[PDB]
């Protein structure tokens, strides 16, 4: 996973974004990065 201030993206959310957004969704983040 990637590091940042963004919450760990779920693979289900990624799939959702794949459907509704033609642009490549952002990569999943480390667990707890959203709170960091």
Method: NMR
Where in the sequence is the domain holding 32, given as residue range(s)?
A: 1-36
Distances (CA, A) of 2 to 5, 10, 19, 20, 28: 10, 13, 22, 23, 6
Task: Give one DSSP letter per residue of 1-28, joined into a string.
Answer: -B-SSS----HHHHHHHHHH-SSPPPPP
Longest Cα pair distance anywhere in the chain, in angstroms? Answer: 29
For residues 2 and 21, give the distance between their C-alpha atoms in angstroms, rounded to a whole number. Answer: 21
Contact residues for 9 (Cβ-Cβ < 8 A; gap 6+): 25, 26, 27, 28, 29
Residue from 35, 15, 20 nearest 6 by CA = 35
Q: What's the domain count of the chain?
A: 1
């Amino acid at each position: 996973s990637q590091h940042g201030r963004t919450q760990d993206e779920n693979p289900v959310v990624h799939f959702f974004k794949n459907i509704v957004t033609p642009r490549t969704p952002p990569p999943s983040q480390g667990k707890g990065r959203g709170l960091s």
